[PDB]
Amino acid sequence: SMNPPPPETSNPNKPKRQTNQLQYLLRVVLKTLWKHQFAWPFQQPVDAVKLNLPDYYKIIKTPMDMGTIKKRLENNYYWNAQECIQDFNTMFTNCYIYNKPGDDIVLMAEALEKLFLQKINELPTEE
Numbered sequence: 849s850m851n852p853p854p855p856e857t858s859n860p861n862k863p864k865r866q867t868n869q870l871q872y873l874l875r876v877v878l879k880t881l882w883k884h885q886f887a888w889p890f891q892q893p894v895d896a897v898k899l900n901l902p903d904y905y906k907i908i909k910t911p912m913d914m915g916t917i918k919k920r921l922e923n924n925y926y927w928n929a930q931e932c933i934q935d936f937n938t939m940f941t942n943c944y945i946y947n948k949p950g951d952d953i954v955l956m957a958e959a960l961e962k963l964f965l966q967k968i969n970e971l972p973t974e975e
């Protein structure tokens with residue numbers, strides 16, 4: 849009945865850089881998702897203790913959430929856009945793996961995911 853430590857959002861041993869793609873991921877993609885009415889359950893790590901889901905971190909071994917992604921972007925954690933995109937993908941996939949197809953949280957995820965894909969489609973070329 850304990851949560852794991854949340855994913856790191858900074859690491860002095862991990863190389864980082866700014867790219868126009870990462871800037872787009874923060875200012876366009878993250879910002880757009882963050883303000884969506886269905887965003888709030890994804891704005892921080894899943895609190896399996898409070899939700900009384902004792903099997904959550906037994907099934908989900910690579911947790912990820914938009915709060916973590918937001919901080920990673922703001923804190924200049926990433927080296928490239930692929931790292932950040934993978935984190936988004938992990939967030940959605942986890943939700944679909946743990947929850948049932950009909951569940952409210954899945955329908956909320958699906959709405960955010962559609963939006964994410966619409967924005968990621970126009971990711972700028974690196975320059």
Ligand SMILES: Cc1noc(C)c1-c1ccc(-c2nc3cnccn3c2NC(C)(C)C)cc1
Pocket residue numbers: 889890894899901942943946947952953
């Ligand atoms: C994201 C995510 N990936 O897996 C699970 C499980 C969640 C999840 C599910 C549910 C919630 C939630 N948190 C509150 C807090 N207070 C009341 C309800 N809550 C609900 N359930 C809702 C409304 C989202 C169905 C949060 C995260």
